[PDB]
Short mmCIF file of C-alpha atoms in Angstrom, two decimals:
data_model
loop_
_atom_site.label_atom_id
_atom_site.label_comp_id
_atom_site.label_asym_id
_atom_site.label_seq_id
_atom_site.Cartn_x
_atom_site.Cartn_y
_atom_site.Cartn_z
CA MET Z 1 41.34 -1.88 51.21
CA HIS Z 2 40.08 -4.76 49.06
CA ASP Z 3 36.52 -3.63 48.34
CA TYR Z 4 37.20 -2.98 44.66
CA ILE Z 5 39.47 -5.94 43.93
CA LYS Z 6 36.73 -8.09 45.46
CA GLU Z 7 34.91 -7.64 42.15
CA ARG Z 8 37.96 -8.72 40.14
CA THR Z 9 37.11 -12.29 41.12
CA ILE Z 10 33.40 -11.85 40.39
CA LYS Z 11 34.08 -11.85 36.65
CA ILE Z 12 36.08 -15.07 36.99
CA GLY Z 13 33.59 -16.92 39.17
CA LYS Z 14 30.88 -15.89 36.72
CA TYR Z 15 33.03 -16.70 33.69
CA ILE Z 16 33.99 -20.20 34.82
CA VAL Z 17 30.28 -21.05 34.74
CA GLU Z 18 29.65 -19.15 31.50
CA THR Z 19 32.19 -21.27 29.63
CA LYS Z 20 32.28 -24.19 32.07
CA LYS Z 21 36.04 -24.29 31.48
CA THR Z 22 38.85 -24.72 34.01
CA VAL Z 23 40.74 -22.03 35.92
CA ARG Z 24 43.52 -22.55 33.37
CA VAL Z 25 41.19 -21.14 30.71
CA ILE Z 26 40.09 -18.19 32.83
CA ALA Z 27 43.60 -17.36 34.02
CA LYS Z 28 45.03 -17.17 30.50
CA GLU Z 29 42.19 -14.82 29.57
CA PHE Z 30 42.87 -12.45 32.47
CA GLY Z 31 46.62 -12.77 31.99
CA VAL Z 32 47.39 -14.32 35.37
CA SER Z 33 48.46 -17.67 36.81
CA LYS Z 34 46.06 -20.33 38.08
CA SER Z 35 47.81 -20.16 41.45
CA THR Z 36 46.83 -16.48 41.61
CA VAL Z 37 43.25 -17.00 40.45
CA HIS Z 38 42.38 -20.11 42.47
CA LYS Z 39 43.85 -18.21 45.42
CA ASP Z 40 41.07 -15.62 45.32
CA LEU Z 41 38.47 -17.93 43.77
CA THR Z 42 38.72 -19.90 47.02
CA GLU Z 43 39.31 -16.93 49.33
CA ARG Z 44 37.75 -13.64 48.24
CA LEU Z 45 35.27 -15.19 45.81
CA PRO Z 46 33.68 -17.29 48.58
CA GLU Z 47 34.30 -14.58 51.18
CA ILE Z 48 32.17 -12.07 49.27
CA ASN Z 49 30.00 -14.71 47.60
CA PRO Z 50 29.73 -18.25 49.02
CA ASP Z 51 27.10 -19.35 46.50
CA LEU Z 52 29.12 -18.19 43.50
CA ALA Z 53 32.13 -19.94 45.02
CA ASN Z 54 30.33 -23.26 44.53
CA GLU Z 55 30.24 -22.77 40.76
CA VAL Z 56 34.02 -22.91 40.41
CA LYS Z 57 34.04 -25.69 43.01
CA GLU Z 58 31.67 -27.80 40.90
CA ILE Z 59 33.93 -27.93 37.84
CA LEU Z 60 36.81 -28.78 40.18
CA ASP Z 61 35.15 -32.01 41.32
CA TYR Z 62 34.91 -32.93 37.63
CA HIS Z 63 38.53 -31.99 36.92
CA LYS Z 64 39.65 -34.66 39.40
CA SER Z 65 37.48 -37.35 37.81
CA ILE Z 66 39.23 -37.23 34.43
CA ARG Z 67 42.46 -36.16 36.15
CA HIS Z 68 43.59 -39.79 35.95
CA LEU Z 69 43.71 -39.30 32.18
CA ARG Z 70 45.28 -35.84 32.33
CA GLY Z 71 48.14 -37.33 34.32
CA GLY Z 72 49.57 -38.52 31.02
CA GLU Z 73 50.77 -34.96 30.44
CA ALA Z 74 52.10 -34.50 33.98
CA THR Z 75 54.27 -37.58 33.46
CA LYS Z 76 56.54 -35.82 30.96
CA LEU Z 77 56.18 -32.51 32.79
CA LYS Z 78 58.40 -34.05 35.46
CA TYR Z 79 61.28 -33.83 32.99
CA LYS Z 80 60.63 -30.14 32.38
CA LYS Z 81 60.06 -29.40 36.07
CA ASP Z 82 62.62 -29.44 38.88
CA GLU Z 83 64.19 -32.59 40.31
CA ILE Z 84 62.01 -35.59 41.13
CA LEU Z 85 63.11 -37.26 44.37
CA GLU Z 86 61.33 -40.35 45.71
CA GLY Z 87 59.15 -38.96 48.49
CA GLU Z 88 55.57 -39.02 47.23
CA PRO Z 89 52.76 -38.86 49.83
CA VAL Z 90 50.69 -41.77 51.13
CA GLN Z 91 47.99 -42.92 48.71
CA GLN Z 92 45.91 -46.02 47.98
CA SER Z 93 44.51 -47.93 45.01
#
């Protein structure tokens, strides 16, 4: 049964809009990983509340806009992360 846990995401979906921050800010507050939050924020959240699911989706569209600038941090992260083989996907400019 997931009738109770369904509310666990409610707080998040409502918090993301209250602070207008990213899932990374809401995950650290709850004590979980973004991969775990976004998982429900895009599954249960929308499943039980499609409208509220848009809130978290809105900030996402904005996170990709400035993402080009955030990449600066991901550049070095490659050194801290696992190997980095040459096999990136197909993209354009």
